[PDB]
């Protein structure tokens, strides 16, 4: 908002610059990671003017009092930009394997030694006092690569106390949304934590810090011991769906759906024929890692409650297009984390091949619940966590209205953004006032989603969670889904 | 007095060490009626105990109840278990939450399981035979 | 040694596997039909558990943990049923899940899969954990029997009372009488004593549940264990005997620990009834030091502050293990009303009782209960309302009346009390007037009993220019209410 | 029946005692298992009432090989009306399993039961048609502008695939006609030989002034109009003539 | 009866003596402003759930006979078998209400419940 009008009126910009000053005065670690997102938003080596002027003013006001560490973080972020730009496909596309080869021209991020401020790893909020407990002590460059979406880069940082943490640098990927709307998850976590009834159990949504660098670039956190189920369950060399059941196939499951998408009338028949011979094997994910039954039960109940809370969080905050690669399960805590978040809140019902299921719940997930399924714990946890925001309806809606009135918004359906993330499965198969109108429309949609339904009835927590879980397990609608959604 | 001066040497042992000294010294006999009697002074540190229980966001910091239950079970088998259980029934804590099942908290076998061959069972049997003395 | 030898022999026999499994299945099934089974004889369960983790590498490069059914070739359902009877832990649920998975995999080619739901329900009831209670209160309930019809009404107590005595024919004819006292102790004032006296025509401990919760020392003629010894101590704490009370306290404390520590091998919610009784019996011990000597306002305030600090961490706790300690606190604070003789200090304990009942109503209204937050009105209207104060406790009355679906008397008591509060202006009144205005301003904005243009200049406005962390919190609440 | 109409809970439950202690000694197929489900649905549990019907239909379907014929329709109508307000299952099952089987199976009581089943099926199909109309008015309208903006190489194949997707999703616009046809067929069959529900005679006209202008609904009521009475269409002349 | 305060009490008494449909509509929801415990149960004729836990609050108040007669009428409406034990234990004007639960369930089988119209 400060980047919108820095020269307007008489006192507006003045009070805005006076209010954005005390934050940089008291918590510089919270603001130096967000000022760079607009100070280096157009850095290309080898409207926006007002944003650049505001960035220059903020830098000039910060450097006047703050010590010489102001440009150290700028150089550190330029190092990440160089990491995200210099990467080439002729070097680390088929050279991943198992070794971790470093990169020569980077050379310890242009030979850095230590930073006075901590990195994106972790930070505990203060209550009025300054804190410099955790900082950067050293750094090592190994250039790990585990992924194939768009040449992902994985690096490691060793700050104070000597702890190795993995970071993810993305290239040609818009991570601005993954940084502005991801904080809504921790907001809802704090909302459910304030409630005393919702504190007997955890049902917490795990969050991860994300700092954006520029357009089509971003840096997110990678927790140690997190492997996505897309490469752990459905895979040719390592996956419980194939290495355990040799009778059935794994690859032709996608081909059968690609041969059906070409047609519509036989969609339900093809889905039934594919599901009658294929059962879920995701339930064997917990006992293969914890032999002790107590910890096994703890992990399975934590996973069930985590997915039950994430389903409702996704339903209330949109975030459609939940493929098998985005959902990330943790090994030491058994919690599902959304890492991609490619599309906006309300975009699945308007894109080609529209999404029907409002969240991610397949046969693998419904079998991971155990022996009772959804009726036992899933639906009860859902109806318990759905009423935590009905008592505070006038609070959770205030975040969307303030995150949608930003100038850098990219949630509307663009002719290129709605197809650049869907043309890859197609290639694998083939071997303005309108913005404000849509904003008000989706605001009314999210207002009618909770404590009500589009049918006009009340549909309280006793029936809303049942409707949500019935919109998930329905083969007639799953046959109308995208082929790349479920293998 | 000498034992207290040696235990409180350059250490307050109020917030966490006061409970760690009683939770890590559970390798004595069944007549450990001294630690249970000394832990009764935790009522004066309720403000610190509440903060320590609120800061715990994982499955930990609640091993005190498991240690007390193990001590009570060990004293029920031996003799003079009346005063032992009376001293052990002074937890004065009712916020043991954020858990579904307590683990065994055994590390001797985890440290010895470093071997990968079939000789791990022989090492475990040898350790179990040497433990009885 | 046998737990490892049973695996070492099976890994080498490759043939003899069926002969060794035929004996194991019979050994595991012989414990059924209420046969002779006790401790030191359930080593088969430990052997089967060890054969599921350390026997993964004993076979060839195949048969992962997902196919651990052929590790011993036994009856996983029978193993789970035997484990739930003796162990009753997560191991039984894991064995039941393995049995269900094996039965589902065998279909791609206590019988008929009908006992699986019963075993799962029994395992969940023996666990009693949060996930177990969630699974029991909805799901896996395919046998709507007359006995299990009340096992899901633990939250609400209104419909649970009409669905308990619905069937006069119950098992052993003790489940009805033994639960009548527990159902009448939740919500009642004085109708429980008549029922206990008329039920005289195993359950003697439940008869004192209503006496020890209201007028303990006054109902000494209610005699026609843990709770019995607690009631004896409550009778003996009348500042005339101390050694007998201190001895009965220890004898009761060393009583329940044995059966609650020997049988409970692993649980997370079974120790809550233990710590609740521990706190309830420790509270009276700590209060006895005050009864042994004179009463001082300073030490009374100190013990109330420490009790509030011990109770504030119980905010993430339900009524399953809080009602007993609350009732114990109420009775140990009410027993000193008869031996007061401290006229200059009576108002001190009166205000202590007032604040305690206020906190009780606050913690009771948050769990959607109706009769428990109304129990607080009895003492504050029979002992505290004898002076007819201006405004010190008339807030929780309106709160518990608004908690109901009447919304009529709660909106009238505030209008009745503000009329005298505005005249009594000529301390605590200054800080309570703002909240008394905020409560009505927020209660008339959701029911629309009057036009909203009045509170803007009369109720919400006067709560600003009138008004010490409590005063700051009250001003914060009033400002946020006006802002919203 | 008279106790459930006054929002009371204990009095309608008192009726269960005698019918379970004296009448349930023979364990009949289906003679009194309806008021139990009704009084259980009157509560806020909504689970035992929805489970007893699934438990009893399994034994009623096997006993088909009197009062059973007339009660088998209401036993399905009750469950169909109770699962349409709680959304415990997908609505595509009752259309061919529960609400469908209550028509081809089924004496003023039998006529009243058929009337109730027909009106329940008609109102369910009407709710489904209203949902379909709202979806076609909201999602299609939101997608039309997006497609017109995207329509402004390789993009020709994407446009052809979008045209194919449109010609495939018009299947719902073609199937809402069938969704309305069954509703009209149930409305024309319910009002005959039935009273107390004369307020559904113009709901059919609501789906007749613009929906039947291009559909085949003009030819179905002309063959079934000789049995329906016009003595209940009196509030209709004020707009039917217009 | 001055200051215009007795007018509301007189109107409430007239409405209670009338008991007609209009009188019941005027009494329901609250007509006069009275926080007395006696008038707290005069508006709970429709619902019987919360009306049962509100009759045990006037134990120390006078007129215990009326409180017992109202508890009996509230326990005779909704109950299965807990009324016989209460009637047998309340023995320690209201004898007609004691047979209210006996004549409603197992009349000839509860002939030992003797320890007017309904008699």
């Amino acid at each position: 908002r400060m980047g919108t009008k820095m020269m307007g009126g008489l006192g507006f910009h003045e009070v805005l610059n006076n209010l954005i000053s005390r934050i940089s005065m008291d918590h510089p670690h919270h603001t130096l990671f967000i000022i760079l997102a607009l100070a280096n938003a157009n850095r290309d080596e080898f409207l926006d003017e007002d944003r650049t002027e505001a960035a220059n003013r903020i830098i000039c006001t910060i450097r006047s009092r703050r010590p010489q560490m102001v440009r150290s973080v700028e150089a550190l972020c330029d190092a990440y930009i160089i990491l995200a730009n210099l990467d080439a496909t002729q070097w680390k596309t088929q050279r991943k394997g198992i070794n971790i080869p470093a990169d020569q021209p980077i050379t310890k991020l242009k030979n850095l030694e230590d930073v006075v401020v901590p990195t994106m790893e972790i930070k505990v909020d203060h209550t009025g006092e300054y804190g410099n407990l955790v900082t950067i002590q050293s750094f090592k460059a190994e250039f790990r690569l585990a992924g194939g979406v768009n040449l992902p880069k994985i690096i490691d940082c060793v700050g104070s106390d000597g702890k190795e943490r993995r970071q993810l640098v993305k290239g040609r990927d818009d991570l601005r949304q993954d940084a502005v709307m991801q904080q809504v998850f921790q907001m809802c976590n704090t909302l459910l934590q304030r409630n005393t009834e919702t504190r007997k159990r955890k049902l917490t949504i795990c969050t991860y810090k994300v700092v954006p660098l520029s357009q089509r670039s971003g840096v997110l956190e990678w927790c140690t011991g997190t492997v996505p189920i897309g490469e752990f369950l459905v895979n040719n060399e390592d996956g419980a769906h194939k290495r355990y059941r040799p009778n059935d196939f794994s690859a032709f499951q996608c081909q059968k759906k690609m041969m059906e998408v070409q047609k519509f009338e036989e969609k339900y028949e093809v889905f039934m024929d594919v599901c009658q011979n294929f059962q879920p094997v995701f339930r064997y994910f917990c006992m293969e890692k914890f032999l002790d039954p107590a910890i096994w039960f703890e992990k399975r109940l934590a996973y069930t409650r985590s997915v039950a809370t994430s389903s409702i969080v996704g339903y209330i905050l949109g975030l459609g297009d939940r493929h098998v690669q985005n959902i990330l399960i943790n090994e030491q805590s058994a919690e599902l984390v959304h890492i991609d978040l490619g599309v906006a809140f309300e975009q699945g019902k308007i894109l080609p091949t529209p999404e029907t299921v409002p969240f991610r719940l397949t046969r693998d997930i419904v079998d991971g619940m155990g022996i009772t399924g959804v009726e036992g714990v899933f639906r009860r946890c859902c109806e318990k966590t759905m009423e935590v925001m009905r008592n505070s309806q006038e609070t959770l809606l205030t975040i969307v209205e303030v995150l949608l009135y930003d100038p850098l918004f990219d949630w509307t359906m663009n002719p290129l953004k709605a197809l650049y993330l869907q043309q890859r499965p197609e290639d694998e198969t083939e071997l303005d006032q309108s913005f404000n109108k849509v904003a008000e429309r989706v605001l009314m949609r999210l207002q009618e989603k909770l404590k009500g339904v589009e049918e006009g009835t009340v549909l309280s927590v006793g029936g809303q969670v049942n409707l949500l879980i019935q919109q998930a397990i329905d083969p007639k609608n799953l046959s109308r889904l995208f082929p790349g959604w479920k293998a | 007095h000498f034992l207290s001066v040696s235990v409180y040497d350059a250490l307050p042992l109020t917030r966490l060490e006061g409970l760690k000294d009683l939770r890590r010294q559970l390798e004595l006999h069944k007549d450990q009626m001294v630690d249970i009697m000394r832990a009764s002074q935790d009522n004066p540190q309720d403000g610190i105990m509440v903060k320590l229980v609120v800061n715990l966001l994982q499955l930990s910091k609640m091993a005190i109840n498991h240690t007390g239950e193990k001590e009570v079970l060990e004293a029920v088998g031996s003799c003079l278990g009346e005063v032992g259980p009376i001293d052990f029934s002074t937890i004065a804590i009712q916020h043991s939450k954020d858990a579904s099942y307590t683990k065994a908290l055994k590390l001797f076998e985890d440290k010895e399981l470093q071997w990968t061959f079939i000789m791990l069972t022989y090492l475990n049997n040898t350790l179990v035979e040497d433990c009885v003395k | 040694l046998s737990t490892h030898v049973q695996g070492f022999f099976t890994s080498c026999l490759r043939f003899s596997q069926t002969s060794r499994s035929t004996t194991p299945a019979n050994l595991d099934s012989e414990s059924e039909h209420f046969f002779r089974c006790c401790l030191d004889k359930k080593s088969q369960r430990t052997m089967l558990a060890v054969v599921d983790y350390m026997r993964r590498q004993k076979r060839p490069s195949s048969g992962t943990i997902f196919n651990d059914a052929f590790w011993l070739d036994l009856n996983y359902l029978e193993v789970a049923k035997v484990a739930q009877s003796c162990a009753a832990h997560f191991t039984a649920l894991l064995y039941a899940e393995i049995y269900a998975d094996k039965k589902s995999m065998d279909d791609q080619e206590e019988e008929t899969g009908i006992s699986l739901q019963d075993l799962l329900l029994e395992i969940y009831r023996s666990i009693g954990e949060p996930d177990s209670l969630y699974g029991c209160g909805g799901g896996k309930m395919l046998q709507p029997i007359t006995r299990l019809r009340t096992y899901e009404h633990e939250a609400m107590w209104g419909k649970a009372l009409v669905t308990y005595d619905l069937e006069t024919a119950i098992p052993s004819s003790t489940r009805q009488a033994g639960i009548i006292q527990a159902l009448q102790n939740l919500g009642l004032c004085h109708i429980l004593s008549v029922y206990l006296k008329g039920l005289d025509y195993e359950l003697e401990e439940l008869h004192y549940q209503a006496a020890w919760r209201n007028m303990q020392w006054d109902h000494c003629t209610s005699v026609s264990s843990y709770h019995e010894s607690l009631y004896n101590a409550l009778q003996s704490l009348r500042d005339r005997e101390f050694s007998t009370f201190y001895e009965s306290l220890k004898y009761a404390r060393v009583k329940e620990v044995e059966e609650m520590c020997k049988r409970s091998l692993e649980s997370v919610y079974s120790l809550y009834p233990t710590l609740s009784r521990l706190q309830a019996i420790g509270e009276l011990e700590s209060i006895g030091e005050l009864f042994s000597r004179s009463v001082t306002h300073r030490q009374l305030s100190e013990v109330y502050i420490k009790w509030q600090k011990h109770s504030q961490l119980l905010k993430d706790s339900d009524f399953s293990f809080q009602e007993p300690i609350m009732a114990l606190r109420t009775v140990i604070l009410e027993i000193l009303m008869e031996k007061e003789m401290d006229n200059s200090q009576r108002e001190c304990i009166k205000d202590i009782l007032t604040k305690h009942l206020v906190e009780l109503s606050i913690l009771a209204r948050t769990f959607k209960n109706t009769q428990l937050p109304e129990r607080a009105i009895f003492q504050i209207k029979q002992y505290n309302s004898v002076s007819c104060g201006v405004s010190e406790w008339q807030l929780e009355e309106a709160q518990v009346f608004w908690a109901k679906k009447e919304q009529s008397l709660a909106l009238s008591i505030l209008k009745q009390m503000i009329k005298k509060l505005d005249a009594s202006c000529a301390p605590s009144l200054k800080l309570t007037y703002t909240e008394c205005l905020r409560v009505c301003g927020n209660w008339l904005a959701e029911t629309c009993l009057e036009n909203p243009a009045v509170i803007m200049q009369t109720y919400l406005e006067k709560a600003v220019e009138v008004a010490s962390d409590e005063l700051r919190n009250g001003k914060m609440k009033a400002f946020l209410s006006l802002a919203r | 029946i008279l106790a459930r109409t006054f929002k009371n809970t204990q009095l309608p439950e008192r009726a269960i005692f005698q019918i379970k202690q004296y009448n349930s000694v023979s364990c009949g197929v289906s003679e009194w298992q309806l008021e139990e489900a009704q009084v259980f649905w009157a509560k806020k549990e909504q689970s035992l009432a929805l489970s007893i019907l699934k438990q009893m239909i399994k034994k009623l379907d096997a006993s088909c090989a009197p009062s059973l014929k007339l009660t088998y329709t209401e036993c399905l109508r009750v469950c169909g009306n109770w699962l349409a307000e709680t959304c415990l299952e997908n609505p595509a099952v009752i259309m061919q399993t529960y609400l469908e089987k209550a028509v081809e199976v089924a004496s003023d009581e039998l006529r009243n039961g058929k009337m109730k089943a027909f009106l329940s099926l008609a109102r369910f199909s009407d709710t489904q048609y209203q949902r379909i109309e709202n979806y076609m008015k909201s999602s299609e309208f939101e997608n039309k502008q997006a497609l017109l903006k995207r329509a402004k190489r390789y993009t020709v194949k994407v446009q052809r695939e979008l045209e194919l997707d449109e010609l495939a999703l018009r299947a719902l616009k073609e199937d809402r006609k069938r969704f309305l046809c069954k509703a009209v067929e149930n409305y024309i069959n319910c009002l005959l030989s039935g009273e107390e529900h004369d307020m559904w005679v113009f709901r059919l006209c609501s789906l007749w002034l613009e929906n039947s202008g291009v559909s085949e609904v003009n030819g179905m009521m002309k063959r079934d109009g000789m049995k329906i009475p016009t003595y209940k269409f009196l509030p209709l002349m004020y707009q039917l003539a217009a």
Side-chain angles (χ1 to χ4, degrees), chain A residues 42-164:
Chain A
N42 195 20
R43 292 289 84 179
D44 179 70
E45 292 76 12
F46 297 153
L47 300 180
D48 49 353
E49 57 273 338
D50 197 5
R51 298 181 181 180
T52 56
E53 293 179 1
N56 293 131
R57 291 300 180 89
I58 292 179
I59 291 300
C60 180
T61 53
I62 288 181
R63 190 177 301 179
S64 180
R65 183 180 180 272
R66 290 302 179 181
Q68 208 180 0
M69 39 67 61
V70 286
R71 81 279 183 272
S72 60
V73 186
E74 190 266 358
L76 184 140
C77 90
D78 294 336
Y80 292 161
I81 296 179
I82 294 178
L83 259 306
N85 294 340
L86 191 139
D87 46 357
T89 60
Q90 235 291 148
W91 181 51
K92 285 297 298 180
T93 34
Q94 300 293 339
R95 276 68 55 182
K96 38 180 300 301
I98 195 61
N99 48 14
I100 315 180
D103 192 54
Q104 306 295 337
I106 300 312
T107 316
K108 301 305 177 183
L109 300 177
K110 275 67 183 177
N111 301 120
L112 42 64
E113 44 276 356
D114 53 351
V115 191
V116 202
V117 297
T119 181
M120 203 203 53
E121 42 182 0
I122 32 180
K123 178 183 179 61
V124 182
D125 301 326
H126 302 285
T127 180
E129 61 179 0
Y130 183 82
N132 193 19
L133 291 317
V134 181
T135 180
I136 297 300
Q137 189 269 341
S138 60
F139 178 85
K140 57 180 184 179
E142 282 69 22
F143 199 84
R144 186 54 181 176
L145 188 143
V149 272
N150 199 34
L151 47 149
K153 294 89 60 181
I154 310 182
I155 55 102
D156 301 332
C157 300
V158 182
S160 60
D161 118 292
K163 181 59 182 60
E164 302 179 1

Side-chain angles (χ1 to χ4, degrees), chain A residues 248-263 275 277-278 429 479 483-484 486-487:
Chain A
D248 295 332
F249 49 83
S250 59
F252 301 92
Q253 300 180 267
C254 300
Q255 302 180 3
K256 288 186 175 182
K257 298 183 179 182
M258 297 304 176
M259 293 299 300
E260 171 269 348
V261 170
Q262 300 178 1
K263 297 182 179 181
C275 298
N277 301 330
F278 285 83
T429 304
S479 60
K486 176 60 180 59

